[PDB]
């Protein structure tokens, strides 16, 4: 099918004003492409806040507005609050199926940026003895929660065997995850040095074995 | 308006599942059931729409022989037969309605069901071996199913740690746990409890 495409992440401070974006892979989003908008906040709590590109439901505050904004649909919040803090998915109709973007996750802006600690593990001795290892890279204290994890043998990019969490909240509202390489004992033997890259805010923090 | 969905489901690969979503309130008017899933590590995907009154459905061409939806007008319930499932089928499914005398154009998703979760797995029941990490750490290996408790010599060291989410490596799960010296593992459904200490190398 057609393919809808938002931003992966964004960030808004209270009171600022932010647009989020909701774009077709087939052309312009027309009228008949019905946008609607779902909000998803913690522990599946979703609202859906248009339909019709621009018609808010009952219950929606008025901060929200839906509209076309050249080729694409979009979702304005005028005066952001900290409970507008979620994850938002437009929908596109197109005429006898509905397909969903890949959501957009909204940061309110509560604490100044932090970017991640990283700590990165080899396998242990015991580990070994299975003939397995585990290459573990601990990622915390990021804010906002969202980063990309990239992996290294030798300098060279890895591309298998790569186990990534979800970023998860901390106590003090900053975010954690975790990466896992998966190896044999043979195959981490055979080489010099192993590296985890996570790529936060436009910055790699990197460590390597 | 309510919607009621049917239990927590657990299957193994090539089996099939039946889901359900009873709507409450407003059922003398037709209305729209839309159908969605959400894995744990993506967002939202349209399955299907039908209507309970008249039977009518729309259909995502992805699900077509994977998702069968049908419906019963009286007893305002909608089902979704899942068939031939696969670890991509495990996820939380939705059902959903519109707004009661609302438009067309109206926002379609206004009501939501608690969601219906589906697990597919081959894997037996496996205790998870446990190895050190050396900030410090503890690695928890090759369990099933969810869940494993963690804490660091026996819940007196608490500040400092990070515990994070499992993962699924190789059809089992995976877990791992640090500190700025002796972590407890208990994984229940094993019925297990190892602890393991940091010596140094
Ligand atoms: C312009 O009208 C519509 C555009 C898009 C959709 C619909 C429209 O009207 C309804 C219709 O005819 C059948 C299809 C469908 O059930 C569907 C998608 N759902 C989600 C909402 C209601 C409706």
């Known amino acids: 099918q057609a393919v809808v495409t938002q931003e992966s992440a964004l960030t808004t401070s209270p009171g600022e004003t932010v647009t989020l974006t909701c774009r077709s892979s087939?052309?312009?989003?027309?009228?008949?492409?019905?946008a609607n908008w779902v909000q998803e906040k913690p522990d599946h709590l979703f609202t859906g806040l248009i339909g019709?590109?621009?018609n808010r439901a009952p219950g929606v505050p008025a901060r929200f507005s839906g509209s076309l904004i050249g080729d694409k649909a979009a979702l304005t919040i005028t005066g952001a609050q900290t409970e507008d803090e979620a994850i938002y998915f437009c929908?596109?109709?197109?005429?006898?199926?509905?397909?969903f973007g890949g959501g957009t996750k909204l940061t309110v802006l509560g604490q100044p940026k932090s970017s991640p600690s990283v700590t990165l593990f080899p396998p242990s001795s015991e580990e070994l003895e299975t003939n397995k290892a585990t290459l573990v890279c601990t990622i915390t204290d990021f804010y906002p929660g969202v980063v990309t994890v990239d992996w290294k043998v030798d300098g060279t990019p890895v591309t298998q065997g790569m186990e990534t969490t979800q970023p998860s909240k901390q106590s003090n509202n900053k975010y954690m995850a975790s990466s896992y390489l998966t190896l044999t004992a043979r195959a981490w033997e055979r080489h010099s040095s192993y590296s985890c890259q996570v790529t936060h805010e436009g910055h790699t923090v990197e460590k390597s074995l | 308006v309510q919607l009621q969905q049917s239990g927590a489901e657990l299957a193994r690969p090539g089996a099939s599942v039946k889901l359900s979503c009873k709507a409450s309130?407003?059922?003398?008017?037709?209305?729209?059931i839309n159908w969605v899933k959400q894995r744990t590590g993506q967002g939202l995907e349209w399955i299907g729409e039908?209507?309970?009154?008249?039977?009518?459905?729309y259909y995502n061409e992805k699900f077509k022989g994977k998702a069968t939806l049908t419906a019963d007008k009286s007893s305002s319930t909608a089902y979704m037969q899942l068939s031939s499932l696969t670890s991509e089928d495990s996820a939380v499914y939705f059902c959903?309605?519109?707004?009661?005398?609302?438009?067309?154009?109206?926002?379609?998703?206004?009501?939501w069901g608690q969601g219906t979760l589906v697990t597919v797995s081959a894997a037996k029941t496996t205790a998870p071996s446990v190895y050190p990490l050396a900030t410090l750490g503890c690695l928890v290996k090759g369990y099933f199913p969810e869940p494993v408790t963690l804490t660091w010599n026996s819940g007196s060291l608490s500040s400092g740690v990070h515990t994070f989410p499992a993962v699924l490596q190789s059809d089992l799960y995976t877990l791992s746990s640090s500190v700025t010296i002796t972590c407890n593992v208990a994984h229940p459904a094993s019925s297990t409890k190892v602890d393991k200490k940091i010596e140094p190398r």
């Open positions: 087939t052309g312009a989003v027309t009228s008949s492409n019905y």
């Open positions: 929908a596109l109709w197109y005429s006898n199926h509905l397909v």
């Open positions: 039908i209507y309970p009154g008249s039977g009518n459905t």
């Open positions: 019709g590109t621009n």
């Open positions: 959903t309605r519109g707004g009661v005398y609302y438009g067309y154009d109206d926002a379609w998703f206004v009501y």
């Open positions: 309130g407003y059922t003398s008017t037709d209305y729209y």
